[PDB]
A paper describes a structure:
Hsp90 is a functional homodimer composed of two identical subunits, each one consisting of three domains: the N-terminal (NTD), for ATP- and drug-binding and a co-chaperone interacting motif, the middle (MD), for client and co-chaperone binding, and the C-terminal (CTD) domain, for constitutive dimerization as well as co-chaperone and client interaction.
In this work, we present the structural characterization of hHsp90-NTD in complex with JMC31 through X-ray crystallography. In the hHsp90-NTD–JMC31 complex, the main moiety responsible for the binding in the ATP-catalytic cavity is resorcinol, a chemical motif shared with radicicol, a known Hsp90 inhibitor. The resorcinol hydroxyl moiety in position 2′ establishes both direct and water-mediated interactions with the carboxylate of Asp93. The nitrogen atom present in the aliphatic linker between the aryl and the terminal cyclohexane forms a direct H-bond with Asp54 and a water-mediated interaction with Lys58.
Residue numbers in the entry: 15 to 225
The structure:
């Protein structure tokens, strides 16, 4: 193996129903959240590079790419952000899933708008509105490349990854549900990016396919 399995420390089930009962009607939100996460990690590497420019030896270009693949039924979002160590990976998709759900449910009960979801650290899980499964590949300067994977059931895996090296950053592959292929269409992606992510301060490039 060298594959490790972790049980969700929270009810990810409770998070998932909250996300359904909050965004099922506007699923395109997932793109906003993932792009927003990318921008966050890009801000971090930018910031660290100011004090230590050798942080950029793993890649100088700071960007976000979107890659639909109809044949595979995947939407992939790549960024050249700071990436996650193994511990960052578990902290951000596991640990925070518990405390961030708790925090976000409290704020919603007190009247906060749903659009705050990203601020409670659980925006990533909106991906499960469109994806049956999600793989996260990540690389941080201070660690090896890892692959995280979950169908948002009771568990997720982490493994040392041995695919193509990214130099630094994070790639999220959405294995879309059969009924949500619309997020593979160029026009659709474009509209969502225009609508939600126009103020993102890094270039966001859609890779259109040939047909
Ligand atoms: C420890 C240093 N590493 C990073 O922080 C990092 N590196 N890559 N990413 C990253 C993560 C995701 C999701 C899988 C969680 C992503 O879609 C894209 C990313 O670049 C991240 C990342 C980790 C967490 C988040 C979530 N931020 C919530 C935060 C809460 C307080 C308000 C401001 C925003 C967003 C991006």
């Amino acid at each position: 193996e060298e594959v490790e399995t972790f049980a969700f420390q929270a009810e990810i089930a409770q998070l998932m129903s909250l996300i359904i009962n909050t965004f099922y009607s506007n699923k395109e939100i997932f793109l906003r959240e993932l792009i927003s996460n990318s921008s966050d990690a890009l801000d971090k590497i930018r910031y660290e590079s100011l004090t230590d420019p050798s942080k950029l030896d793993s890649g100088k270009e700071l960007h976000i790419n979107l890659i639909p693949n109809k044949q595979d039924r995947t939407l992939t979002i790549v960024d050249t952000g700071i990436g996650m160590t193994k511990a960052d990976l578990i902290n951000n998709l596991g640990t925070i899933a518990k405390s961030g759900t708790k925090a976000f449910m409290e704020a919603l009960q007190a009247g906060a708008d749903i659009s705050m979801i990203g601020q409670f650290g659980v925006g990533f899980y909106s991906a499960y509105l469109v994806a049956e499964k999600v793989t996260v590949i990540t690389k941080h300067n201070d660690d090896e490349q890892y692959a995280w994977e979950s169908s948002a059931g009771g568990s997720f895996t982490v493994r040392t990854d041995t695919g193509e090296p990214m130099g630094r950053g994070t790639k999220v592959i959405l294995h879309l549900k059969e009924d949500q292929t619309e997020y593979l269409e160029e026009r659709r992606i474009k509209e969502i990016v225009k609508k939600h992510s126009q103020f993102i301060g890094y270039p966001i490039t859609l890779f259109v396919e040939k047909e």
